[PDB]
Amino acid sequence: SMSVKKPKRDDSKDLALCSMILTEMETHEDAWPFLLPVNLKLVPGYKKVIKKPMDFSTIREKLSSGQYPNLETFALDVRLVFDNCETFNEDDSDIGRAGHNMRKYFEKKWTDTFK
């Protein structure tokens, strides 16, 4: 509360560390469904159904331009990518499996880097 604070966690490396995680997600062999925004002119149903599209290139631009206020807003966009994937793609599909695999890969890096 006012004039009452928990000890200050060092957040000075968070930007660099989120960048490194995102590089690792970008370079994973199963990243291909997520590298670029879904083409809303060419994929029937996507625009109406997926209210907030998100992809790795869009996260990269937001990160690079100071549009993430803190490491949690960064994780929310990464998770949005996988939540969108599950919304639109059957589990038993190449893209569906890619999304599950990448979400697991992300969550481990996240825990190991920050928790």
Curated annotation (Swiss-Prot):
Tree of life domain: Eukaryota
Domain Bromo, residue spans: 9-113
Location relative to the cell: Nucleus
Tissue specificity of this protein: Expressed at varying levels in several tissues, whereas a smaller transcript was expressed specifically in testis.
Quaternary structure (record): Component of the BRF-1 ISWI chromatin remodeling complex, at least composed of SMARCA1 and BAZ2B, which regulates the spacing of histone octamers on the DNA template to facilitate access to DNA. Within the BRF-1 ISWI chromatin remodeling complex interacts with SMARCA1; the interaction is direct. Component of the BRF-5 ISWI chromatin remodeling complex, at least composed of SMARCA5/SNF2H and BAZ2B, which regulates the spacing of histone octamers on the DNA template to facilitate access to DNA.
Similarity remark: Belongs to the WAL family.
Function comment: Regulatory subunit of the ATP-dependent BRF-1 and BRF-5 ISWI chromatin remodeling complexes, which form ordered nucleosome arrays on chromatin and facilitate access to DNA during DNA-templated processes such as DNA replication, transcription, and repair. Both complexes regulate the spacing of nucleosomes along the chromatin and have the ability to slide mononucleosomes to the center of a DNA template. The BRF-1 ISWI chromatin remodeling complex has a lower ATP hydrolysis rate than the BRF-5 ISWI chromatin remodeling complex.
Record's protein name: Bromodomain adjacent to zinc finger domain protein 2B
Gene name tied to this protein: BAZ2B
Span covered, complete protein: 2054 to 2166 of 2168
